[PDB]
Design a protein around this motif. Structure first.
Motif, short mmCIF file in Angstrom:
data_model
loop_
_atom_site.label_atom_id
_atom_site.label_comp_id
_atom_site.label_asym_id
_atom_site.label_seq_id
_atom_site.Cartn_x
_atom_site.Cartn_y
_atom_site.Cartn_z
N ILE A 2 -14.45 -12.60 -6.01
CA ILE A 2 -13.21 -12.25 -5.32
C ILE A 2 -12.33 -13.50 -5.20
O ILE A 2 -12.74 -14.49 -4.58
CB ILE A 2 -13.51 -11.61 -3.92
N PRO A 3 -11.14 -13.48 -5.80
CA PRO A 3 -10.26 -14.65 -5.80
C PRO A 3 -9.53 -14.82 -4.46
O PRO A 3 -9.48 -13.86 -3.68
CB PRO A 3 -9.28 -14.34 -6.92
N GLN A 4 -8.99 -16.02 -4.21
CA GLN A 4 -8.29 -16.31 -2.95
C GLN A 4 -7.15 -15.32 -2.64
O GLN A 4 -6.97 -14.91 -1.50
CB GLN A 4 -7.75 -17.74 -2.93
N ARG A 5 -6.42 -14.94 -3.68
CA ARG A 5 -5.23 -14.08 -3.53
C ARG A 5 -5.53 -12.64 -3.09
O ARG A 5 -4.62 -11.91 -2.72
CB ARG A 5 -4.41 -14.07 -4.83
N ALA A 6 -6.80 -12.25 -3.14
CA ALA A 6 -7.21 -10.87 -2.86
C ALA A 6 -7.31 -10.54 -1.37
O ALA A 6 -7.18 -9.37 -0.98
CB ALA A 6 -8.55 -10.57 -3.57
N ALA A 7 -7.56 -11.56 -0.56
CA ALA A 7 -7.81 -11.40 0.87
C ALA A 7 -6.72 -10.64 1.64
O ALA A 7 -7.01 -9.69 2.37
CB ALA A 7 -8.05 -12.75 1.50
N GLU A 8 -5.47 -11.04 1.44
CA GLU A 8 -4.35 -10.47 2.19
C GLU A 8 -4.23 -8.95 2.05
O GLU A 8 -4.16 -8.23 3.06
CB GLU A 8 -3.04 -11.17 1.83
N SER A 9 -4.23 -8.45 0.82
CA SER A 9 -4.09 -7.01 0.59
C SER A 9 -5.38 -6.25 0.92
O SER A 9 -5.33 -5.07 1.25
CB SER A 9 -3.58 -6.70 -0.82
N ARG A 10 -6.52 -6.94 0.84
CA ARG A 10 -7.80 -6.35 1.26
C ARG A 10 -7.87 -6.20 2.78
O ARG A 10 -8.71 -5.46 3.30
CB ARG A 10 -8.98 -7.17 0.73
N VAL A 11 -6.99 -6.90 3.49
CA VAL A 11 -6.83 -6.70 4.93
C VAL A 11 -5.68 -5.72 5.23
O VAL A 11 -5.84 -4.78 6.02
CB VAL A 11 -6.59 -8.06 5.65
N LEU A 12 -4.54 -5.94 4.58
CA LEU A 12 -3.31 -5.22 4.92
C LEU A 12 -3.27 -3.73 4.55
O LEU A 12 -2.48 -2.99 5.13
CB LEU A 12 -2.08 -5.93 4.36
N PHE A 13 -4.14 -3.28 3.65
CA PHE A 13 -4.28 -1.85 3.40
C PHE A 13 -4.68 -1.10 4.67
O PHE A 13 -4.34 0.06 4.83
CB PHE A 13 -5.22 -1.54 2.24
N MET A 14 -5.40 -1.77 5.57
CA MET A 14 -5.79 -1.16 6.84
C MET A 14 -4.56 -0.88 7.70
O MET A 14 -4.58 0.01 8.56
CB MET A 14 -6.81 -2.03 7.59
N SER A 15 -3.48 -1.61 7.46
CA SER A 15 -2.21 -1.33 8.12
C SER A 15 -1.39 -0.25 7.38
O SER A 15 -0.99 0.75 7.99
CB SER A 15 -1.42 -2.63 8.36
N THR A 16 -1.15 -0.43 6.08
CA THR A 16 -0.32 0.52 5.33
C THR A 16 -0.97 1.90 5.19
O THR A 16 -0.28 2.92 5.25
CB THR A 16 0.04 0.00 3.92
N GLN A 17 -2.29 1.93 5.00
CA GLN A 17 -2.99 3.19 4.74
C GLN A 17 -3.53 3.81 6.05
O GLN A 17 -3.34 5.00 6.32
CB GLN A 17 -4.13 2.97 3.72
N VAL A 18 -4.21 2.98 6.84
CA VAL A 18 -4.97 3.46 7.99
C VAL A 18 -4.15 3.42 9.28
O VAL A 18 -4.48 4.10 10.24
CB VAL A 18 -6.36 2.72 8.09
N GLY A 19 -3.07 2.63 9.30
CA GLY A 19 -2.18 2.62 10.46
C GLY A 19 -2.53 1.64 11.57
O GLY A 19 -2.00 1.75 12.67
N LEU A 20 -3.44 0.70 11.30
CA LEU A 20 -3.64 -0.41 12.23
C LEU A 20 -2.36 -1.26 12.23
O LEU A 20 -1.61 -1.27 11.26
CB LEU A 20 -4.84 -1.30 11.86
N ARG A 21 -2.10 -1.94 13.35
CA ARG A 21 -0.94 -2.79 13.46
C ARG A 21 -1.33 -4.05 14.23
O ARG A 21 -2.41 -4.10 14.85
CB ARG A 21 0.23 -2.04 14.12
#
Ligand SMILES: [Ca+2]
Ligand SMILES: [Ca+2]
Lengths: 498, 498
Positions: free
Chosen positions: A168-187
């Motif tokens: 898993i490369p360094q650049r992957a972390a952000e979107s692997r976290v932020l999908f929980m906001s866009t998809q799941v609705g965490l804020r």
């Protein structure tokens, strides 16, 4: 880009005195600032002992505050943690550490003796030597922040012969976290209290659960051992706002929540998330009935993280791509541009963007099979529905071809799972006399109950299953063969019955 | 990274036949796929005419579907759109186009004659020559996708003598959209219907509104002219889920929503967002009372986008950093590491991460003043409250220093705004006889009402204002001097009264 380290660093500037890590059974609580200080302390000690950036270090431990600190410390130093399931056999773990060319292995301790006998040059570090109930053994000068680059290895996670080391490369972390906001609705916010039911050695348990909890300025609640009553009490006591659990755990939680005589207050829980592709309709209805919050189904891989989701799911197999994602359904065994005609079955493939792994460690051949021309191949069969959603049909490798027609065992297993007297079922193809396969069902009776091929066939005939999908044969068995992880060995079962 | 183009490209693969752009008054509706085809068509035509990647092109037009297409087409080609307020004077616009060394200017048309007289080498392109009610004039071969790089210029937006050309790099787009998810609680889905009240030449109107609407697979509703009744009807008819508006527009909308005899149904609206730093307590209470949805206050700059926010605000000046953000409060006029002691006033500075501009075009000196050692300086005064939030106190340049004590005119203006008979108020410092300034209030009476210094002072004495903050003097004026944009000229006012 925000690496894992950077997301946590920023969160700590914003919410230094807010609780970051809670271990309620142990009475241990650490703020964002307190956690950062302990991470920095362990990192410095690891560096003084010789560990250097971009060196690979295995981690073999169950969920705990100490392992959270160790993993983040390795990452802070700039080493690449390779998180391993501690439930695997010792010689299997030793082999993977050897294959991976690890500089060291951080273990909760007879795994060490196994690493010594493998011939590996991996130095053994006992977790208890580094940090104990949040308290680090401190020494060495303060260390530099290593240069982190987007494409560079950051973490290694293992898949389902032997597990493969997905980089898993360094650049992957952000979107692997932020999908929980866009998809799941965490804020973002200090309201976030996340229950840590998922293993940290699973990408969901690490990025979507632990890292998301802290990155959003919230609290991660550590659960070392799963117990449904204890988990629901923690929901009440800690005011948990979100949980991600397996279908198995959710069924257990729903049952524990179902008593009228119970005093449990689950009002704080606003998000219940799961990978429900394998989840039967009955389990989904009980989750809707007995647990609060918005239910979200996700489809995810170690390799690509989130590719499909569904809010308020009615079944477990119907989903659609969300933010970040681009998906196609292509001819099975064909090129990435061979789009199927709508309604026809093919392999689901997903665009390899920032969230995607960069390959399997020391396995060039397996990488070439999975990553082609900018796309990750799931090895799952799927179809576009009349409504324009994706229906997951099952694994390419599980597909049964009978008289030139594709049959998916998962569909048949879900029907048969509800038949009177059936406690377990696996559907397999056995060779017929015309160069194809015959649909065959291996079934286990509920205790003391009697199953018969005739009654099971009678049940199938009353179902919505097309004629060509009904099992031609039943094997009634007292048990199914399973590995040490409670997974059915499909290939050993074929051999036992045939 | 996802550039603006890439976010829209991905959205169109996911939701090709879902409405992207709606102009209800004109009866114009375009799907995501239809919009992409028209963007591609205009881009190809622009390229055939000679336009090349990384060339700067001014855009001078009011909100409309045609300008949306033009801007996105320029970006698709790889040109850098420089969005300008069309309400500015012609010679002022011509000067900025000249200073910017623009290859061309796309204008809704006597601005052209002004560009010709400036001496500029900017080729004039009339918007009506490119696209009319969504329909492009099509010609030229299909064009390559240009290589987009993270730090490379993507868009230019102008600030509040002459406006400055803030250069927005490619890497800034994603977080300038995604803050609407982490902070404001928008999420991916076809439920998203966004009302386009904000100007497209403002960073909020472009990234947080237009680009967010499409990137999340939703609909952008075009509003060419603001009218409160028409806007609320559109909320009902189009099932708007979110709106971002100015305090002025919100006051108008709240009033239009307040009638009991009204049939308006505002139930679909779940998010009302605003930059409410200047918003008086009274306007905020009417918004809470008369408009539905969650209210979110944001603090933002052209230069850094979102740095602070507050859910369910009670006042307009108290906020805290969200996801992406890192902030400090430093000694006014000091270095970026000179942190103030808690409770002491200083300048708010914000970390210059991915969302940040890369400098002002052709203004090296102004850039050096704003971007220092990884930080953007807001030029706003702020303080950490006992509760650990940020209280915005006002602009550094507006601060009045009387007897060596800092007074902020905005605070005094909010108190005086509620005094009987006052319709407008501006608080300024005038030179006293001891090398400092005296707090002075310039006030305009409500029509037909009589104001007096005595009654205004009596009102101030009954307020919570500290002694040292009460105006020493009043100027009662029939009107305040304002530019063509209804902004009070503070420096012209000082001269008129002094
Ligand atoms: Ca047996
Ligand atoms: Ca006058």
């Amino acid at each position: 880009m925000q690496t894992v380290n950077e997301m946590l660093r920023r969160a700590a500037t914003r919410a230094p005195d807010h609780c970051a890590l809670a271990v309620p059974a142990r009475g241990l609580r650490l703020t964002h600032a307190e956690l950062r200080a302990r991470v920095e302390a362990v990192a410095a000690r690891l560096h003084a002992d010789g560990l250097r950036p971009q060196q690979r270090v295995a981690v073999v431990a169950p969920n705990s505050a100490d392992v959270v600190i160790a993993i983040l410390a390795l990452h802070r130093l700039g080493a690449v943690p390779a998180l391993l399931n501690p439930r695997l056999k010792s010689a299997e773990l030793a082999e993977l550490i050897k294959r991976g060319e690890m500089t060291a292995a951080v273990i909760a301790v007879q795994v060490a003796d196994a690493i010594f006998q493998s011939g590996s040059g991996a130095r053994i570090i006992f977790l208890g030597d580094l940090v104990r109930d949040g308290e680090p053994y401190s020494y060495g000068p303060p260390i530099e922040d290593p240069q982190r680059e987007p494409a560079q290895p950051a973490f290694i996670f293992y898949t389902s012969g032997l597990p493969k080391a997905a980089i898993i490369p360094q650049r992957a972390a952000e979107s692997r976290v932020l999908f929980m906001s866009t998809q799941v609705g965490l804020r973002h916010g200090r309201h976030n209290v996340v229950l840590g039911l998922m293993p940290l050695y699973h990408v969901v348990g690490f990025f979507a659960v632990l890292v998301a909890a802290l990155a959003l300025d919230g609290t991660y609640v550590v659960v070392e051992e799963f117990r449904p009553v204890d988990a629901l009490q923690l929901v009440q006591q800690e005011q948990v706002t979100s949980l991600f659990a397996t279908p198995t755990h959710l069924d257990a939680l729903a049952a524990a929540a179902a008593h009228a005589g119970s005093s449990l207050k689950l009002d704080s829980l606003r998000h219940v998330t799961f990978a429900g592709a394998t989840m039967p309709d009955a389990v989904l209805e009980t989750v809707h009935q007995h647990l609060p919050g918005e239910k979200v189904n996700i489809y995810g891989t170690t390799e690509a993280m989130n590719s499909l989701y569904m809010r308020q799911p009615k079944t477990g197999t119907e989903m659609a791509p969300g933010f970040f994602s681009e998906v196609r359904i292509v001819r099975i065994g064909g090129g990435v541009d061979e789009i199927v005609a709508n309604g026809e079955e093919g392999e689901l493939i997903v665009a390899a963007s920032d969230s995607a792994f960069v390959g399997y460690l020391n396995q060039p051949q397996a990488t070439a099979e999975k990553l082609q021309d900018g796309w990750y191949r799931t090895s799952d069969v799927a179809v576009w529905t009349p409504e324009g959603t994706v229906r997951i049909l099952g694994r390419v490798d599980d597909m049964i071809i009978s008289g030139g027609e594709n049959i998916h065992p998962s569909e048949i297993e879900r029907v048969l799972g509800t038949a009177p007297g059936v406690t377990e079922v696996v559907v397999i193809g056995l060779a017929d006399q015309r160069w194809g396969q015959s649909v065959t069902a291996c079934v286990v009776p509920r205790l003391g109950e009697t199953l018969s091929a005739d009654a099971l066939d009678t049940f199938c005939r009353s179902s919505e299953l097309a004629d060509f999908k009904r099992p031609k044969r039943y094997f009634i068995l007292d048990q199914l063969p399973k590995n040490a992880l409670n997974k059915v060995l499909r290939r050993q079962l074929v051999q036992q019955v045939s």
